[PDB]
Motif scaffolding. Structure first.
Motif, PDB file in Angstrom:
ATOM      1  N   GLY A 242     -32.070   5.653 -20.430  1.00 35.49           N
ATOM      2  CA  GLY A 242     -32.113   4.471 -21.278  1.00 35.49           C
ATOM      3  C   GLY A 242     -32.884   3.316 -20.662  1.00 35.49           C
ATOM      4  O   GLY A 242     -33.726   2.701 -21.320  1.00 35.49           O
ATOM      5  N   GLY A 243     -32.604   2.999 -19.394  1.00 34.86           N
ATOM      6  CA  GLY A 243     -33.302   1.902 -18.747  1.00 34.86           C
ATOM      7  C   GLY A 243     -34.772   2.192 -18.517  1.00 34.86           C
ATOM      8  O   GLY A 243     -35.618   1.308 -18.678  1.00 34.86           O
ATOM      9  N   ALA A 244     -35.099   3.430 -18.137  1.00 37.10           N
ATOM     10  CA  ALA A 244     -36.491   3.770 -17.869  1.00 37.10           C
ATOM     11  C   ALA A 244     -37.345   3.784 -19.131  1.00 37.10           C
ATOM     12  O   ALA A 244     -38.561   3.587 -19.041  1.00 37.10           O
ATOM     13  N   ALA A 245     -36.743   4.003 -20.298  1.00 36.19           N
ATOM     14  CA  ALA A 245     -37.477   4.071 -21.554  1.00 36.19           C
ATOM     15  C   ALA A 245     -37.482   2.757 -22.323  1.00 36.19           C
ATOM     16  O   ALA A 245     -38.047   2.701 -23.419  1.00 36.19           O
TER      17      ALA A 245
ATOM     18  N   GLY B 100     -37.179   9.133 -18.719  1.00 37.91           N
ATOM     19  CA  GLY B 100     -37.234   7.910 -19.502  1.00 37.91           C
ATOM     20  C   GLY B 100     -38.641   7.357 -19.623  1.00 37.91           C
ATOM     21  O   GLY B 100     -39.052   6.904 -20.695  1.00 37.91           O
ATOM     22  N   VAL B 101     -39.403   7.392 -18.526  1.00 38.03           N
ATOM     23  CA  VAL B 101     -40.792   6.941 -18.583  1.00 38.03           C
ATOM     24  C   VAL B 101     -41.604   7.831 -19.520  1.00 38.03           C
ATOM     25  O   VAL B 101     -42.439   7.346 -20.293  1.00 38.03           O
TER      26      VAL B 101
ATOM     27  N   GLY C  29     -39.987  10.061 -29.417  1.00 42.20           N
ATOM     28  CA  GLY C  29     -38.911   9.922 -28.457  1.00 42.20           C
ATOM     29  C   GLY C  29     -37.820   8.944 -28.824  1.00 42.20           C
ATOM     30  O   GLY C  29     -36.864   8.781 -28.058  1.00 42.20           O
ATOM     31  N   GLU C  30     -37.935   8.281 -29.977  1.00 36.81           N
ATOM     32  CA  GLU C  30     -36.920   7.316 -30.386  1.00 36.81           C
ATOM     33  C   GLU C  30     -35.586   7.997 -30.659  1.00 36.81           C
ATOM     34  O   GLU C  30     -34.524   7.435 -30.363  1.00 36.81           O
ATOM     35  N   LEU C  31     -35.620   9.205 -31.227  1.00 37.13           N
ATOM     36  CA  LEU C  31     -34.387   9.952 -31.458  1.00 37.13           C
ATOM     37  C   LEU C  31     -33.683  10.272 -30.146  1.00 37.13           C
ATOM     38  O   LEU C  31     -32.462  10.117 -30.035  1.00 37.13           O
TER      39      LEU C  31
ATOM     40  N   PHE D 238     -29.396   9.262 -26.113  1.00 38.65           N
ATOM     41  CA  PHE D 238     -28.926   8.947 -24.769  1.00 38.65           C
ATOM     42  C   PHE D 238     -28.225   7.595 -24.718  1.00 38.65           C
ATOM     43  O   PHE D 238     -27.276   7.425 -23.946  1.00 38.65           O
ATOM     44  N   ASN D 239     -28.654   6.632 -25.539  1.00 37.67           N
ATOM     45  CA  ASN D 239     -27.957   5.350 -25.595  1.00 37.67           C
ATOM     46  C   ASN D 239     -26.548   5.504 -26.156  1.00 37.67           C
ATOM     47  O   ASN D 239     -25.602   4.886 -25.651  1.00 37.67           O
TER      48      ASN D 239
END
Lengths: 122, 440, 199, 429
Positions: C72-75, C146-147, C156-158, C163-164
């Motif tokens: 989550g944080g990396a994306a 995530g990157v 990748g939004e799904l 993951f969120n």
């Protein structure tokens, strides 16, 4: 020169049933036919992972070398805290992540390389 | 300039071939001016570490890539069409396996690698053997793995309990799950899950989107790793050359066997598969080979078809543009099923072992050794030294001596790489034929 | 009352402090009257079991709480014994674990042995993937994944939302676990005071 | 004629029952013509392989099925309602297990069938508690926890200290607990958890499709399992002459509990016909008798309870996975009868306190037992160590373990289904 092996079968069928039930990948209950019966006799496994014994030593039985050691996990063959024996070489094409059987395999192949190189020299 | 554009477009393949050449040169230079003795074991480990790092990076990607790609490919096609495509793919795979095995047997009989046999040079003890029926039961058990999570890092294999050595040995078989990824079971489960997902509907659509996005992210990781790949290939080649000792002295009598193996691999990879591709698609097979050079060199460096599977998939996708679904359905299956070079190796090695012990080969023995080589090539592991177990099964089935297996392990490090190259080439060519067929 | 609101709002920290104090009191009480050797290790294990339970609950949530929310944080940031060499090699190998599922419950380590008894006593290092849980490899893989999801467009939004949501559920389990915590710290402190002796 | 239409409608029931009967007949016929002595090892293994294939196929899908079904079931109900339903479910499970244990002890006392590292019972209970809350989900997906005793102090003071290590298993209890908690947490969130709910529901539906294919394959595997188990016998006459009273005790207790006690409880709490429910769940019962494992027949039980009987999806998917692990009446009756039989073998008297300890430890062992073939044999050692007079000569119990284990599996899955139906009616009220 190696000491004689003391690696007998399970004293009671329940112990054999217990250790064969907890082996990795067990899918069904072992049959009563497959359990060892009568007086204990010598037994040897054809493969043993290195993570089952702290150390292994050579032993002699019927003019054949075997590896012997004490098991540290009940999921390992022979049970938990049971002195068991296994063959000098593992099954061909099979590996146990290092350990005595592998070290024997590379020792034998390096001996073959040395003698074959000597043959080339002659 | 046109030449500048040519190097910019083909920069990766030139880096890979220069890396292979530099690895060979560096290994030769270190071995000549030293080797495993001048520098210590710690220095040897530090020298060979980058290749191990590349191998670990490639091995980390295999599981999610294979699972997601096969789920998407199975869910993206109708069950009848998928069944027909799979039937054609298996027909091609077995046809190629029989052709490679027959070529290997013919070359081994024509050139006679074991005719001289030096001075036998065999005794310590005899390694335990695995029965043919037990091996086939092991294959059938590895299909449909009992535990999905446990299959991600370990696989089932049957062992034996040698009881009553003096007391009429019985050799009771007991099985267990041993270390090593169960690729075949995961492949089968992914295909079944994909067809079930297609049978579902909108819920299957949501899961398809999930797995496709996961596959795309995995492909991004593959793209990142592919740039580091040449350095790892160079260090793999250099370290493997340095570690192996006394070059030439080993080859002076194994030259016939090495020539048989590499000549069979070269003939199968330059005259049989390109001929099939040309006769079925009427295109240029060497353009496909030029597109797939760097997965082939990665396979040669790593000696593992599973490790080079993501790079082969990506190169098949971008160059020589096979569609995503058909490629991602064909390549993972052939990476664990189609092994032409391995079968040729095992046939040549078994004939050489038979000639070492001065045993007749007749006709039915040749037929059954071909059949067992073909039937045991499928399900073999794509890891390095993965053909040794299947060769042992072949030797047990054909009733040949086993004590000469040490000569096969003596020089298998290079021919295994050749086998991996041949297997991944067969994968790519089969994908090419299927893509041309679906284009029509 | 304002003081009642202060007590109600900050209940968890005061409960933790009271738990530490009560654990100290219970530790001295057990190590005094009765005796720490009277019950023995067999009863000591059952006495300290709630702390082990809290530790197990804390360890069960580490893998999801890391992998999720690191993806989550990396994306979402958006563009603007062991020797020195062997320890470094083990650290490098643990960064790239070579098996994602196996990295969740074991880690690579190097052990020394004298298996090469020929000639001098040469130490041959070997690795066997000992039992661990491997923070480093999972963290690196989650950041990289995530990157990569960030590099992807709307595809990748799904995965990001998946993951969120997984991270939010894991946070809910964290909040539930931290309510059981004061008993765990109480019993851990009591066990540590009982085991040692410095007064 | 309507006979062919009825046969086509009930093809699964007929196929499974005929598979069981034909497995018995084939086992008897092969045993008469050689008894595997003429077959030999390789032919015997090839003969018994398809049952192992069926078992592996059913074990392949049990983990994702249980996890996703429990997440969906726990997220489908409010936390208060789910808590009340769970409290009623565990109360029913405890009462039924206690009744089965008491019946086993009483019947074994009436008929009198009787005439190595240790493991403390406190450590066994702590191991069960640790298995309830695992320390690693991925590790708990394929292995469990067990304690070990080693001597680490000086030789002058030799005392056994308990150390912990991971043994091979599946640790379904911890995964069940985690799935329930995760589902409750997912429903606690608002629109955020809906995507995860849909994800797990879709995954469960795909697993159900695989379940349908595997259960269509199942009858051949059941037949070969039964035939192989029957063939493996050695001395039927002596074995029966030695263990006939014990087999009669176990089978009679199972039949009484499954045909009189549980139907009576269902009728008292529901005022319906329990045998209609049993007719609905015949096929999972036959599958349980074929495979001797409650986990392998759990998907078929859920499908048959949802479809053949009028049970809501959430109730079944929440109750049946829990009861497949924690509700084991047949294992309890087995373990009680075997403990009394072993105590009578060694001429050791059992007073009131020993009987009470037997009952309590049997309930705990049935809670801790696993839904795998010969899963109740392992906790018999725990019960014997609890009584501590019956030294663990459980080897005499074996050689008839497969048949009684199959009866135990039938009783367990029947109790699970009957409890699910009772809770469905109580919710409907």
């Amino acid at each position: 020169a190696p000491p004689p092996c003391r690696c007998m079968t399970s004293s009671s069928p329940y112990q054999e049933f217990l250790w064969r039930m907890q082996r990795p990948g067990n899918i069904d209950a072992p049959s009563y036919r497959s359990l060892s019966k009568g007086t204990p006799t010598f037994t040897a496994h054809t493969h043993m992972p290195r993570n089952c014994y702290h150390s292994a030593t050579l032993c002699m039985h019927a003019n054949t070398h075997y590896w012997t050691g004490k098991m540290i996990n009940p999921s390992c063959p022979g049970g938990l805290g049971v002195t068991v024996c296994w063959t000098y070489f593992t099954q061909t094409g099979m590996s146990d992540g290092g350990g005595v059987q592998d070290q024997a395999r590379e020792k034998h192949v390096k001996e073959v390389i040395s003698q074959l190189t000597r043959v080339h020299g002659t | 300039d046109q030449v500048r554009r040519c190097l910019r477009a083909n920069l990766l393949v030139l880096l890979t071939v220069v890396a292979v050449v530099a690895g060979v040169a560096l290994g030769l230079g270190v071995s000549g001016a030293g080797g495993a003795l001048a520098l210590g074991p710690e220095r040897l480990s530090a020298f060979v570490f980058p290749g191990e790092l590349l191998l670990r990076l490639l091995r980390m990607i295999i599981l999610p890539l294979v699972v997601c790609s096969l789920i998407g490919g199975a869910a993206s096609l109708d069950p009848g069409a998928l069944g027909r495509l799979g039937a054609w793919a298996l027909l091609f795979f077995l046809v190629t396996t029989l052709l490679a095995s027959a070529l290997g047997v013919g070359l081994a009989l024509a050139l006679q690698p074991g005719a001289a046999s030096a001075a036998i040079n065999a005794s310590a003890e005899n390694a335990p053997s695995k029965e043919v029926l037990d091996s086939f039961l092991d294959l059938a058990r590895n299909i449909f793995p009992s535990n999905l999570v446990s299959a991600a890092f370990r696989s089932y294999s049957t062992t034996y309990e040698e009881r009553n050595i003096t007391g009429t040995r019985v050799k009771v078989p007991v099985g267990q799950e041993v270390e090593g990824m169960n690729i075949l079971g995961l492949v089968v489960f992914a295909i079944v899950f994909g067809v079930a997902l297609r049978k579902l509907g909108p819920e299957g659509e949501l899961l398809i989107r999930f797995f496709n996005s996961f596959n795309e992210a995995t492909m991004v990781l593959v793209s990142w790793i592919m740039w580091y790949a040449p350095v790892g290939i160079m260090f793999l080649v250099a370290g493997k050359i340095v570690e192996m000792e006394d070059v030439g002295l080993l080859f002076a009598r194994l030259g016939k066997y090495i020539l048989c193996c590499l000549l069979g691999h070269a003939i199968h990879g330059l005259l049989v598969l390109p001929l099939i591709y040309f006769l079925f698609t009427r295109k240029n097979p060497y353009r496909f080979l030029w597109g797939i050079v760097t997965p082939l060199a990665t396979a040669f460096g790593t000696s593992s078809s599973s490790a080079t599977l993501p790079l082969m998939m990506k190169c098949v996708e971008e160059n020589n543009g096979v569609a995503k679904h058909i490629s991602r359905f064909i390549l993972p299956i052939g990476a664990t099923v189609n092994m032409d070079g391995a079968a040729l190796f095992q046939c040549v090695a078994a004939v050489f072992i038979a000639q070492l012990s001065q045993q007749s080969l007749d006709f039915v023995k040749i037929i059954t050794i071909l059949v067992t080589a073909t039937a045991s090539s499928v399900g073999a592991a794509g890891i390095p030294a993965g053909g040794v177990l299947t060769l042992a099964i072949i030797l047990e089935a054909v009733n040949l001596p086993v004590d000469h297996i040490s000569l096969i392990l003596a020089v298998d490090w290079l021919v295994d790489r050749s086998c991996t190259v041949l297997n991944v080439e067969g994968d790519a060519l089969g994908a090419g034929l299927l893509q041309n067929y679906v284009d029509r």
